[PDB]
Amino acid sequence: WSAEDKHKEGVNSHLWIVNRAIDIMSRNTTLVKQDRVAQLNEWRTELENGIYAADYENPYYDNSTFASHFYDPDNGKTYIPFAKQAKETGAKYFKLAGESYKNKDMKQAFFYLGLSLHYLGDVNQPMHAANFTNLSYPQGFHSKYENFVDTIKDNYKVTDGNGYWNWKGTNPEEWIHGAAVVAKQDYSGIVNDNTKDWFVKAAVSQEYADKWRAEVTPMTGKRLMDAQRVTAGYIQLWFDTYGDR
């Protein structure tokens, strides 16, 4: 998903997913301790820095190949043979964040948590769970799709307090894998012969630009709603794990 502005949701789908996940936690009045939400807001600059840094510098963006932002659940791999993938990378930063939190280094903790949230957010994008990059056929569709999502994402906010609490076990890798399983199932609702066809014809015809955008909207909304619920669960897991128990 996009992460083009550090502190603005307009062109940062990753930050929008996290902010909507925090709103789910705030809406929950049965299980969530609201001081957790206050801690995320207190260290929001560092959290947002971590969410943005993943797509912009080393080691996180893998020398501009973004290999660690992809993870196919069926084979456990990213799109480049032998490169690091999103499950081991997102789990690495979940644990580094927790160790920093226990040592009371909040700036370090929330930056590493933002990184981990970014990787979990990416495996909820079906193209990232299927190794479909901006060079895959049809080339340029991955990037135009992610730009398009920013223009519609406000229509898919989750407005209830039901995150996926304890969705998977206590291992963060299980959450990243589980989210990629669901996202790859939804891959054909976005990438298929029709959307490929219309995207290619969209260069010459505006009518086709609208056609592929409309076609991918329903599954995009579904994926964005699941990403908010899974992210809220994952933040709650992090505080349950390192927050003193």
Binding site residue list for Zn(2+): 1, 14, 55, 69, 118, 122, 128, 142, 146
**Which CB, 36 or 92, lies closer to Zn ion?**
92
CB of 116 to Zn ion, least distance (A): 12
- 81, exposed or middle or buried, with CB in 10 Å at 0-12, 13-18, 19+? exposed
Which of 55, 72, 150, 186 touches Zn ion by CB under 5 A?
55
Under rule CB under 5 A, residue 153 binds Zn ion? no
Contact 28, 38 (CB under 8 A): no
Token pair 């979990």: residue: 120
22: Cα separation from own chain's centroid? 14
**Which CB, 23 or 62, lies closer to Zn ion?**
62
CB of 244 to Zn ion, least distance (A): 31
Under rule CB under 5 A, residue 150 binds Zn ion? no
Contact 143, 202 (CB under 8 A): no
**Which CB, 46 or 55, lies closer to Zn ion?**
55
Within 59-78, the residues that bind Zn ion by CB under 5 A are: 69
What positions carry a catalytic annotation? 14, 55, 69, 118, 122, 128, 142, 146
Within 99-128, the residues that bind Zn ion by CB under 5 A are: 122
Q: Which two tokens stand for residue 33?
A: 């301790």
CA 167 to each of CA 66, 79, 164: distance values in angstroms, whole numbers, following the listed order: 27, 27, 5
Under rule CB under 5 A, residue 177 binds Zn ion? no
Cα angle value 97/30/106 (rounded, 5°): 20
Residues that bind Zn ion (CB under 5 A): 1, 54-55, 69, 122
